[PDB]
Amino acid sequence: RQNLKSTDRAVQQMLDKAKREGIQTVWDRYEAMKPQCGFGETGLCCRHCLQGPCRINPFGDEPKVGICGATAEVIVARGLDRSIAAGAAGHSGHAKHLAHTLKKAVQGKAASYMIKDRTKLHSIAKRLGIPTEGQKDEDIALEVAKAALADFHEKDTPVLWVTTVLPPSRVKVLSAHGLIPAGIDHEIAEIMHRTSMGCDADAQNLLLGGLRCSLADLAGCYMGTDLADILFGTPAPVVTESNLGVLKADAVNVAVHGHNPVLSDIIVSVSKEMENEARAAGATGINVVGICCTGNEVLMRHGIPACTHSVSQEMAMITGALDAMILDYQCIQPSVATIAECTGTTVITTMEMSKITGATHVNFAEEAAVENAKQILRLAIDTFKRRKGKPVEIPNIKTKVVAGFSTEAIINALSKLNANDPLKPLIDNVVNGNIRGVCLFAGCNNVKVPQDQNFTTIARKLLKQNVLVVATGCGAGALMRHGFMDPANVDELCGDGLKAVLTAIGEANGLGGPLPPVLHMGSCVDNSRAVALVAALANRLGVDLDRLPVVASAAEAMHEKAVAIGTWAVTIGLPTHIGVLPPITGSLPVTQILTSSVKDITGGYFIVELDPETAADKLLAAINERRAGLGLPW
């Protein structure tokens, strides 16, 4: 019964092939882990010193307290804080790498990289207060890169990738609670300090630190988007495909997998120059396909088709047609290195701090990006040759995907209805009820949840209630693989008011049809694009984000990064659903802070709800409560 594992029928087909071939999958490794530890599930375990491990019984008798005296409240809050810091360390490490890449590019140390989006560069400079008039673009870019790197440590200003991206009234609320980060890596380190043994031991104090570190994560996300747009271009609407059927038996199939596209954007361009070298090997060409966020990056900017996402990533290899999987970091199941020996795929790591035993490593350096890409693609061509004559099983399943909805692209699309006040048509339709509110789907799949089931169940209910739905990361991946990015499905999926708006915008953009049911705003760092859009709406209305009918749903969350994103969504003022249990239920006081009393600090709050129908109802209630607070019908 593969339907209990994944709602994706291409994934189901490959699960059947993996089973008859004896290849263990993530779902098999989950089954072998059951029953999982209830102390860990509830957050009532601590290993922060060598007197541990400590645990607390959720209910009953002793143990009731950690060996040092740490209560359930403290243990739960410390664990959560460390998860937030780990997420911030990933998103911001990605951003730091892009900042170094931009600096190298404009210093003449990496000519494969350049300022591709001069407009974005100048707008970021203006937002940061960096002078542009009279200055060479390379010098403006050097100053932007230096400002990015400066936000990682303490200085005479707070983190500008927080304070310059949210409205002043929001910054004021956060400043009053001490929540503005002083420096990105500074906050990460302070979390690790305060959560170490014999330090912070007050749940509220710990959680305030967590909120501040989540804003350091937001800064890293926004910095990542900004720098990637400068270097690689701001996305605009594009049409492509998704799911395993985008693989081609006749081609060299190369997946780019990870989050930082610094090399894989180069993989894309170099691959086109090697079509003839691939043809000499008997292929039709090189077919680059995306997995996870780096796949989203190249989908958004170049229309590279998305193969699969998150929990089902191993299934691309099970087809037998994946000649190479080119990795950088984050969200890569290390099982890919052993599965590759069964499937023939060449798995290649490229970043010094992210290696996998058994996978080939090819150092990637920006300074040698083209040469390193050719080395990598030649391993892929050799692999294609080795499968001459072997049957492959690529499920003939794919969907049409319209994507590329950066915030700039959304504003441009709206400007076709109102050129000099582009946000007003959107606001007008919120006011008149054609758009009930906005929901951002974000985050991962999680093996505990039948793959995509929460995203699609919740999205269907919200769309029928006229909610404008936007999506990023593997939430966008789930929705795209089930047809939610195909405008042909607007009639089936969308309420009449939402359909009218999507159609009015689409027709004004010359499409002869609507925008798609869900707007793909990009990778997980590109959750920052949704922040930009919401902050622009807030500023246009003269209100703060916690008055807007905007919610978020990390419906199948997995990674520490998703915990960090959900926490900053709460911190900036949003009702934020999470569809898997974070390790908090072992402390009622912590749960009550995160789901209730944080409303009094930031106006946002977590909605923890594992039943997707119920979660949809709770998200709609949150949207409608915001409508009522604005005096609007609902």
46 is known to lie in a ligand binding site: yes
Annotate each residue in 5-34 with x if it binds a copy of itself (CB under 8 A) or - if it does not, as one string.
---------------------x--xx-xx-
Evaluate whether 386 touches 343 at the Cβ level (below 8 Å). no
Which partner from the list ligand F3S, Ni ion, ligand SF4, none does 292 bind, CB cut-off 5 to 8 Å by kind?
ligand F3S
Q: Which of 181, 209, 437, 516 binds a copy of itself (CB under 8 A)?
A: 209
Q: Which two tokens stand for residue 385?
A: 């040759």
CB of 74 to ligand SF4, least distance (A): 8
Burial of 22 from C-beta contacts in 10 A (0-12 / 13-18 / 19+)? exposed
Residues 43-72 contacting a copy of itself, CB under 8 A: 45, 47-55, 62-71
Tally of CA atoms within 13 A in the half-sphere of 53 that contains its CB: 7
Identify any residues that bridge with 129 across adjacent strands, giving them in sequence order. Answer: none
Q: Is the separation of the CB atoms in 334 and 356 below 8 Å?
A: yes
Q: Does 85 bind a copy of itself (CB under 8 A)?
A: yes
439 labelled as ligand-binding? no
Choosing among a copy of itself, ligand F3S, ligand FES, none, which partner's interface includes residue 130 (Cβ < 5 to 8 Å by kind)?
Answer: none
Residues in the interface with ligand F3S (CB under 6 A) total 14
401 Rama class: left (phi>0) / alpha (psi -120 to 50) / beta: beta
Q: Which of 524, 525, 533, 563 binds Ni ion (CB under 5 A)?
A: 524
Residue at token pair 């491990």: 53
Residue 444 touching ligand F3S (CB under 6 A): yes
Site for ligand FES in 8-67 (CB under 6 A): 37, 39-40, 45, 47, 53, 55
Distance in angstroms (rounded) separating the CA atoms of residues 180 and 160: 10
Q: Which residues contact 356 (CB under 8 A, 6 or more apart)?
A: 327, 332, 334, 336, 337, 347, 349
Strand-strand pairing, 306-308 and 286-291: parallel
Are the C-beta atoms of 328 and 260 separated by less than 8 Å? yes
User: Binding segment for a copy of itself among 324-332, 405-413, 426-434, 452-460 (CB under 8 A)?
Assistant: 324-332
Q: Which residue from 9, 17, 19, 41 is in contact with a copy of itself, where contact means CB under 8 A?
A: 41
Residue closer to a copy of itself by CB (options 100, 122) is 100
CB nearer a copy of itself, residue 84 or residue 251: 84
Of these, 157, 335, 585, 595, which contacts a copy of itself (CB under 8 A)? 335
User: Across the strands, what pairs with 413?
Assistant: none
Residue 79 beta carbon to a copy of itself: minimum distance, rounded to whole angstroms: 7
Q: At what angle do helices 184-194 and 72-106 cross, to 10 degrees?
A: 160
Q: 205 touches which of Ni ion, a copy of itself, ligand FES, none (CB within 5 to 8 A by kind)?
A: a copy of itself
Give the tokens for residue 526: 């590109």
Residue 524, annotated ligand binder? Answer: yes
The token pair at 17 is 């092939």
Q: Compose the 576-615 pattern: x for residues touching a copy of itself by CB under 8 A, - for all others.
A: ----xxxx--------------------------------
* Rg of the chain, C-alpha, whole Å: 24
Burial 71-109 (b: 16+ CB within 10 A, else e): bbbbbbbbbbbbbbbbbbbbbbbbbbbbbbbbbbbbeee
Min dist. Cβ of residue 64 to a copy of itself (A)? 7
Amino acid letter, residue 152: F
Tracing tokens 């195909």 back to the chain, one arrives at: 486
Q: Which of residues 161-200 bind a copy of itself (CB under 8 A)?
A: 178, 183-186, 188-200
Q: Give whichever of 56 and 615 is closer to ligand FES, judged by the CB atom.
A: 56
- Residues in Cβ contact with 259 at an 8 Å cutoff, skipping those fewer than 6 apart: 90, 94, 292, 293, 294, 328, 329, 330, 331, 523, 524, 525
For 485, the token pair is 């990015």
Closest distance between a copy of itself and the C-beta of residue 390, in Å?
Answer: 25
In angstroms, the CA 22 to CA 468 distance is: 43
Written as one string, the DSSP assignment of 62-83 is S--S-TT---HHHHHHHHHHHH
Contacts with 607 (C-beta within 8 Å, 6 or more apart), sequence order: 575, 576, 577, 578, 595, 615, 618, 619, 622
Annotation-wise, does 559 bind a ligand?
Answer: no
Instruction: Decide: is 545 part of the binding site for ligand F3S (CB under 6 A).
Output: no
Residue span binding ligand F3S (CB under 6 A) among the ranges 176-184, 235-243, 559-567, 602-610: 559-567
213 among the known binding-site residues? no
The site for ligand SF4 (CB under 6 A) is made up of 46-49, 51-52, 54, 66-68, 70, 197
Site residues (vs ligand F3S, CB under 6 A): 259, 292-293, 310, 331, 443-444, 473-474, 524, 558-559, 561-562
Site residues (vs ligand FES, CB under 6 A): 37, 39-40, 45, 47, 53, 55
Site residues (vs Ni ion, CB under 5 A): 473, 524
For the annotated binding site, the residues are 37, 45-46, 49, 54, 68, 259, 293, 331, 444, 474, 524
